[PDB]
């Protein structure tokens, strides 16, 4: 569970992301494609080339969802219900891949927010992504 501290940390770090969320979302994807090639099996229909608009388009969607979970940090299960349904029933992404994306998201933020990516913030962002992942995987079985 996220503590007040955690919540503050997350809103703060995410606050800084601002308008770059989209691009950081796309970057996290690319990192993931490159470091964990097995994740690619879920996007057989995508152009995964560098600077792919499909990836850009997708990075934005993911970032909007994370931004939505931060805005509703006290009611994520409900704020993300729809996405939880989609992932459980249509996409059916194996659970292990959530941890891989989370990781690439953390690398991306670290790479962009040196002043904010403090040990305390890092810890909070990790618990947060873990929670988002848990919600998105809650209706799997």
């Amino acid at each position: 569970v996220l503590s007040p501290a955690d919540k503050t940390n997350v809103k703060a770090a995410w606050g800084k992301v601002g308008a770059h969320a989209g691009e950081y979302g796309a970057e996290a994807l690319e990192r993931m494609f490159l470091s964990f090639p097995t994740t690619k099996t879920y996007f057989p229909h995508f152009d995964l080339s560098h600077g792919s608009a499909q990836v850009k388009g997708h990075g934005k969607k993911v970032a909007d969802a994370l931004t939505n979970a931060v805005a509703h940090v006290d009611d994520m299960p409900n704020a993300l219900s729809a996405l939880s349904d989609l992932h459980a029933h249509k996409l059916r992404v194996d659970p292990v891949n959530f941890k891989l994306l989370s990781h690439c998201l953390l690398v991306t933020l670290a790479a962009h927010l040196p002043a904010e990516f403090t040990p305390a913030v890092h810890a909070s962002l990790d618990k947060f992504l873990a929670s988002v992942s848990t919600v998105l995987t809650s209706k799997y079985r």
Binding site: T38, T41, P44, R92, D94, R141
Partner: protein, 146 residues
């Protein structure tokens, strides 16, 4: 593999008693029922709405036999699983887009089916050797992903 001649012999000898037809259908069906998300690759099989529906689905049972088939033949190249599953590895990646994690889920299901079937016979030491084979198989199959 990093199997001991002793471990090799245990694997080998239990396998001899296996009906691949039946174990194959049961392993794949159990997979589709315990981890419902693996069904994403078998929509064309039909109704997998219930365990009953999965376990009964002939398409499933038949695919299961094909899979253990290939597995079974791999047990004869235990010293080069890599080389034995190379083409199957490419296929799974490039044509089927199956996440290698699936190979590990099945392996574990396989082990539960063997225990189910052999009771007493499937001892800790024997499970241990099988765990090494299923991991070895999954690794071999995932080897060509890029």
């Amino acid at each position: 593999m990093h199997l001991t001649p002793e471990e090799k012999s245990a694997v080998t000898a239990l396998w001899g008693k296996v009906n691949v037809d039946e174990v194959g259908g049961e392993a794949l069906g159990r997979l589709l029922a315990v981890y419902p998300w693996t069904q994403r690759f078998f929509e064309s099989f039909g109704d997998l709405s219930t365990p009953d529906a999965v376990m009964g689905n002939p398409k499933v049972k038949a695919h299961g036999k094909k899979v253990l088939g290939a597995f079974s033949d791999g047990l004869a190249h235990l010293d080069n699983l890599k080389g034995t599953f190379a083409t199957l590895s490419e296929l799974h990646c490039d044509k089927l887009h199956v996440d290698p994690e699936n190979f590990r889920l099945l392996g574990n299901v396989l082990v539960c089916v063997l225990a189910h079937h052999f009771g007493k016979e499937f001892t800790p030491p024997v499970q241990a050797a099988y765990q090494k084979v299923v991991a070895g198989v999954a690794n071999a199959l995932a080897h060509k992903y890029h």
